[PDB]
Design a protein around this ligand. Sequence first.
Ligand SMILES: Brc1ccc(Oc2c(Br)cc(Br)cc2Br)c(Br)c1
Length: 1182
Amino acid sequence: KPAVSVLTMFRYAGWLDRLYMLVGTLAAIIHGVALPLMMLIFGDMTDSFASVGQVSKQSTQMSEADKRAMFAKLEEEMTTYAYYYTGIGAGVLIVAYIQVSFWCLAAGRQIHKIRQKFFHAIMNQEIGWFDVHDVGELNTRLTDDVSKINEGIGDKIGMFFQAMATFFGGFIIGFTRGWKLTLVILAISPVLGLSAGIWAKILSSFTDKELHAYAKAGAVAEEVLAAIRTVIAFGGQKKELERYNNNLEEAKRLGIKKAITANISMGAAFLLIYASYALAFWYGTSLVISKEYSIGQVLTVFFSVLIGAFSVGQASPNIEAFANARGAAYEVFKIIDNKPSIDSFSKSGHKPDNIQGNLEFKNIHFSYPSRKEVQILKGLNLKVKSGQTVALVGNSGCGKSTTVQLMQRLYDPLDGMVSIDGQDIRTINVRYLREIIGVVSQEPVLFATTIAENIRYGREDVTMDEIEKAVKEANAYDFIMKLPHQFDTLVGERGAQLSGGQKQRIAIARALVRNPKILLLDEATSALDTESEAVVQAALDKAREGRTTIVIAHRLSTVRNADVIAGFDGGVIVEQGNHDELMREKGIYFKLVMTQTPPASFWRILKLNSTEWPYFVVGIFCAIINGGLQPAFSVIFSKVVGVFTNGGPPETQRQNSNLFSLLFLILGIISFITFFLQGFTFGKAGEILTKRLRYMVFKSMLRQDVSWFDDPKNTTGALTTRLANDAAQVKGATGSRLAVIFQNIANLGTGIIISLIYGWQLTLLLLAIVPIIAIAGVVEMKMLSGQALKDKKELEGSGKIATEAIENFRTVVSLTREQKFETMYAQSLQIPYRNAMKKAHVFGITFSFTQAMMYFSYAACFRFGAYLVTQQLMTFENVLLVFSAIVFGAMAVGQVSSFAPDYAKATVSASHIIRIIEKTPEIDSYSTQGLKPNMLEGNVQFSGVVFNYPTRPSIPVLQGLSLEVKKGQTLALVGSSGCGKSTVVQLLERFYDPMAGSVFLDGKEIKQLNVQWLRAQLGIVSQEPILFDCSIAENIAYGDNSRVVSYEEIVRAAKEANIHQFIDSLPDKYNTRVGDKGTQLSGGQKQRIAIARALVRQPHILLLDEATSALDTESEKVVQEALDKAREGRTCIVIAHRLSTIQNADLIVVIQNGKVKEHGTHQQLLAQKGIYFSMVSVQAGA
Ligand SMILES: Brc1ccc(Oc2c(Br)cc(Br)cc2Br)c(Br)c1
């Protein structure tokens, strides 16, 4: 919404840039003007053939006589027109180069300047300005917005003016050569504007419906694939597929409905558009029979106007290009034009010599940019004498840290003054002030360059001698020399990551080359390892003694030797003095002392699509007819102008034109009828295989075993996404693109034959010319993408050293050396500039070439069409025919190149989808194999089990685990931590087979047992029960599948679980809808429901996995009261973390390191003393 003055935007264009734009825009208008002229001549060529076309047939007496006057007229005329044509082509060749080159030149020249100025502006902002802003956004704002600006002031303007030139130029010629047809042509404009308006309403409204339509299915898929382990446990994999299939079934119906309507729309629209012209032209005929117009003039106006008419449309994008570029320039120039109070690029203010370094802080009230919300310094008084070293101590607020902030004048204070020597800080030059102050900060930063270079950021003029003394005076010499490459090493976020204590010591060296008279050390020892801390501390102590210093840390080791110590409470300076005095004060300081002590041929996807042998042949046959039908319109048009040009005696013409125009409208209706067909057939044929594919994928997906679903690669979202995209994308490829690709090859084919047989060698020529301009049209785009990628690569290097400068900014400014990064940025940019210059010459040449190639190619159409061909008996009516036929047949091939990516994007999306079906699991629930034992009573043996999770085969969970539990008794399971407790239940559900060892139930190894039948006997109840959205009766009935469960049966289970209070309490009762769509309830009820479905199954085995995990107060007491009633009739395993409620358990088992450690009945483990005793003691105590 905000935008910029048109004149400010160009403020960096002067002298030449203004001229370039003037010559370019000029040439741009000449260029535009060229096309409607070219069409004007196409009238005069017509009148020439038309005068001879009328007189030639008017004879029917003399022959040789017509070999004289006619041919002479054609000779002089055609040569004239051809000469002019060759003229225009040269014209466009020149202006088209001038157009793009100059504008791109201006663009480059300015954007270079914009970029430099912009970065300079970023570095000039004071810190309070950064504190309030997001640096990341600002950098992305550096690289993206300047690009928008460049796009707008680029050759797009030239294009705009070329377009307006064709539009004006079109409608002028439109009006002068006649006022009638133009008005008649504008008259039909609203209709075309109106039909394409139905499209923006249909598309936008229906696009949501499908996104709404599948949103119902992909919801199923989301609550399923999220709940997977549950549906896997309860084996609802047949139902959860059935549901998805039932929503898919609707989606396809809506999908076919859309297919019907959208094609009706497209067809009807097209028919309106073509009827609309055909009337303008037939109206154009009605005025020729009246001898009001010439048959060539009808052309001249009818072309010029439609050209100019569409030229409006072709300009519209460049308007947007420019506008966006204005709006993009607003926030950029706002930084450039913003001026700081502080600067630091300013040359102003005193520069004292012989600074003795006497500092004082007077009544300083300050607040950081968070402003009125907080005031962190309320008053203040502090002096520090020259050569002394003062220490600042405090509990919190780090108002300590603020004084170091004010002393570099990063912020100016609200009220009060900071005084270096006698003078107010604000009277001294900012840069020089920063140059007389050294700084060592808590988190040290090193820019990416050599150590010498980072030290060279202390001062730009320095020699390895001074570097050496500096690092040796920081005692950083010894440790870096050992490092390879010596001072030439690397540092940064990338490469050569070092000890912090070494980084700080390079930082102290950097600070030391500064030879500052004032030192600020903030926390520099804090957040550092104890051993190296002393190493650095020594350097700090050696860094002072030449200087006056203020230091802030939480280390009261370094403070003692400070000449003065200062405490803060609430921004108010409170205690000051030598250490001893402060202790004698027994105040804040003392208190703190005591406290701290693969693209490939995939046919099989089409083989799946072969489920329909028909609906393809229908569409294809139907589309090829449509292909053959298109050029016939050109044939008509050719003979409408043809017979009319070839007329001879005028009486017969008027009756014929009617016949033709009638036929054409019979063809348009036959075209509509074929088009809707080729649309609908493919559409339905797409929508059904969409179902088949999504079905088979979703089916194969429920086949895989928990091992797969654990993968970081596959998460619920990524799968729904993979599920939608891949299925849409293959529909696309077998969809419209193919129908069209066949319609068009048919269109060129049926055109090329007609043309070829009519014109001998006329066509053969056009087929030499067209492919070359096409290819030449492609190579340009290749070069374009090439240059684009290259420049992207090059400005990226610069933006990288920008990112460094502005992300680490508060440090660079502390060191000054902003001019450094300015210069570096500048040098970096210099390559894309010299590049951007070449870009213009290239862009220009390619464009001009592809225009010229078209105009000269036009000259060849007629010069050969006349002369050699029309000096022969071969005729004009045909030359027109072949012009249109071939030239359109080609432009229909233009659609091939456009649908090219739709195929690739589809095959890649097929690539995964054919694999996701074919992948098979280790444990497949689908295998009907497995024993299905007849004997009821459950036992469970875990023997010698070693298990590692497939995702994390590093730290093992189970190593040599062994358990046994008899029927009808509870096995309590305790652990130090982890899924060691929980993995048991997973393995009994056979989510996994163990690596080594084995687990039996009835004495049969489950590994050889039927996977499904196994899980069918299991009473799984987990931490967070996931309930699908549906009647709670169904969430319960989920407990048993392969059969519909009785109402009284799901009642009994809700009676069991103690959930009945709710289920009767509700208005709907058992038909109420749950899952946070229809209704919401707390976890206790959800759980009791999960308990209900657990024992609807009438399992022989409950599995209670930390069932009380999320729960509170009486809710626990009631759920536990349900679980406790659920077991004791069954084999049970309870890993519950309430050991108070495990006290009554037939066996308790303590898991340690995946081995069982302790086991026995409660009092039996209580009789011992060890892990379980410690477990029951700790949380009974706490
Ligand atoms: Br009759 C008659 C036939 C084609 C005409 O222009 C074309 C041409 Br030429 C080609 C196609 Br495809 C569609 C139309 Br509409 C006109 Br104007 C009148």
